[PDB]
Design a protein around this ligand. Structure first.
Ligand SMILES: [Zn+2]
Ligand SMILES: [Zn+2]
Length: 382
């Protein structure tokens, strides 16, 4: 029986949060195994695009989950709370690792990894659910622990686990807040309880573990919010998305007006025609990306007008979705297990490279991807 892989995402855990004395369990795991200095997210540095990149090895421009909210000429609208969109395989390009696993006869069990609610290339995981808010830390940890312990024909080669709590605290209070730190501590402790349980079940010794985050988090201080309509008025273009990566589709005949107003450098953002976006972001070729894309500067938000008003103004907040090269956007990568190196540190690297490592650990043929297999070979024990 081959070694299982446990894949854990801590949404929005910034790379530097491992060095603050608030992650005793993860820090111990890192010391036992392999730790990268940091891992860069792909553009845009948002939750759905990057979780899906992690399990496919593809940039968002290639896998088609180009933002959390999208429009498509055939499929219509996509956003996180529209279940039949999120659950429709046609949005999701490439081949996520759970599909690869199931297609070899082996099984995958997922706790709410973006994409896992769809039948991507016709293949659901053996275990999965519709994400809902406020599930307890123990509920999910005990489920994952159960799925790792299963034998016979229900044996899982891949088990995935997701935590939203750090990300949520980051948005609400910022990355330097005591609330963000408390969330980090809580998630770390829960992972500690999972690892202890795995040892008691005798699954620890035969399970490889990868812990990642999808992106970091930057502080958004009071006064750092503008209206998307400050960028372009509604008569000349529609804001398809708000937040930090702002897509505009000019109204019919308004491309020139929209461009005259929007393109170039502004106070706290820059905008480009999608085909002209900075090449280093490897983004802008996908038809689902709006015609004009604006990138807010670090620590600034642009919101739909009705949000700006009910934005109860007072305190510090957080956001991601900024330039993936920024240290604030850096994610975590660490791993430990029987097939992985011990007491090793790796250079900073790009998140598309994780897929090739996982394919090897799962015994599946690597689907075509945007990553470099060389990068994480040093993470392997041999
Ligand atoms: Zn996220
Ligand atoms: Zn977030």
């Amino acid at each position: 029986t081959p070694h299982a892989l446990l894949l854990i995402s801590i949404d929005g855990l910034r790379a530097d949060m491992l060095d603050r004395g608030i992650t005793p369990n993860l820090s111990h795991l890192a010391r036992e195994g392999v730790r990268a200095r940091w891992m860069a997210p792909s553009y845009p540095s948002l939750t759905f695009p990057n979780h899906y990149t992690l399990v496919t090895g593809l940039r968002p421009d290639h896998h088609g989950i180009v933002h959390n909210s999208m429009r498509d000429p055939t499929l219509g609208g996509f956003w996180l709370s529209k279940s039949e969109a999120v659950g429709d395989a046609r949005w999701w390009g490439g081949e996520p690792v759970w599909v690869g696993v199931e297609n070899t006869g082996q099984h995958a069990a997922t706790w709410s990894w973006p994409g896992s609610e769809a039948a991507i290339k016709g293949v659901r995981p053996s275990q999965w659910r519709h994400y809902q808010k406020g599930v307890r830390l123990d509920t999910r940890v005990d489920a994952v622990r159960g799925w790792l312990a299963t034998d016979g024909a229900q044996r899982n080669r891949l088990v995935t686990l997701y935590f939203e709590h750090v990300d949520e605290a980051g948005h609400d209070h910022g990355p330097e807040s005591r609330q963000y730190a408390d969330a980090v501590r809580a998630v770390d402790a829960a992972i500690g309880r999972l690892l202890a349980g795995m040892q008691r079940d005798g699954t620890r010794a035969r399970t490889n573990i990868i812990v990642v985050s999808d992106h970091g988090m930057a502080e958004v201080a009071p006064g750092h919010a503008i209206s998307v309509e400050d960028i372009a008025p509604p008569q000349i273009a529609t804001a398809i998305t708000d937040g930090q990566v702002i897509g505009f589709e000019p109204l019919p005949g308004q491309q020139a007006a929209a461009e005259a107003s929007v393109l170039g450098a502004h106070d706290h953002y820059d905008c480009w025609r999608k085909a002209e976006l900075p090449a280093r972001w490897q983004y802008g070729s996908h038809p689902r990306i709006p015609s004009l894309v604006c990138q807010m500067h670090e620590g600034w938000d642009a919101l739909f007008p009705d949000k700006l008003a009910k934005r109860a103004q007072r305190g510090t907040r957080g956001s991601h979705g900024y330039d993936p090269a920024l240290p604030s956007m850096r994610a975590v990568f660490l791993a430990q297990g029987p097939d992985l190196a011990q007491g090793k540190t790796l250079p900073g690297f790009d998140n598309v490279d994780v897929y090739a490592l996982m394919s090897r650990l799962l015994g599946i043929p690597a689907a075509p991807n945007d990553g470099n297999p060389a990068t994480l070979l040093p993470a392997l024990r041999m």
